[PDB]
Amino acid sequence: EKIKPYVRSFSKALDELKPEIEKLTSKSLDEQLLLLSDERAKLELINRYAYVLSSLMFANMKVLGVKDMSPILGELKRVKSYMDKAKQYDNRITKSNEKSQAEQEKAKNIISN
Amino acid sequence: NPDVLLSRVINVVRAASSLASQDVDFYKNLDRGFSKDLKSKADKLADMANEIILSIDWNNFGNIMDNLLEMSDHSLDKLNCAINSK
């Protein structure tokens, strides 16, 4: 009775995500990188594969019902920390290009001035 | 695509968060077949976690997360030479 909605509901979410997994691991961790050239295009693919797996191993560990969840939780803020870094790096790439194009527009106006 | 499939991951993350929130042992008492269905729904998890085991192919698990994050690090250091030298 009480378990009867949630267990079929969550399994349907597994059923929902189950084709998404197979399209995610369609081509290999080498292949899906080796088809790509930009390391920025290589970047989050490493993360996102780990990003799901982190939640995946946090999910299945609940099914054993083990009272500990720390040594995957200890891995959790790690994966955040590396996701924290290159975004702030990629923020700085903007300011490299954001202001250099204003340098482009300014010096043309100087001869115009 | 990140924003699509992770939104579906988030969808199942919350559903994974929705899983053992209820008291689960009570119908494991009331039948094995609740537990066995919960075992069978874990057999999805025995398959769906294995998909990325297949991508490679607990103490097993403690190994490769290094080797996952191994390859994260050599990006930014190359990105350091790709950008800070640039």
Binding site: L76 | I10, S21, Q22
Partner: peptide, 14 residues
């Protein structure tokens, strides 16, 4: 709405 906060919420519990 940082994308690790879904690890942090307490679920809907009966």
């Amino acid at each position: 709405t940082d994308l690790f906060d879904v690890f942090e919420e307490t679920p809907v519990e009966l």
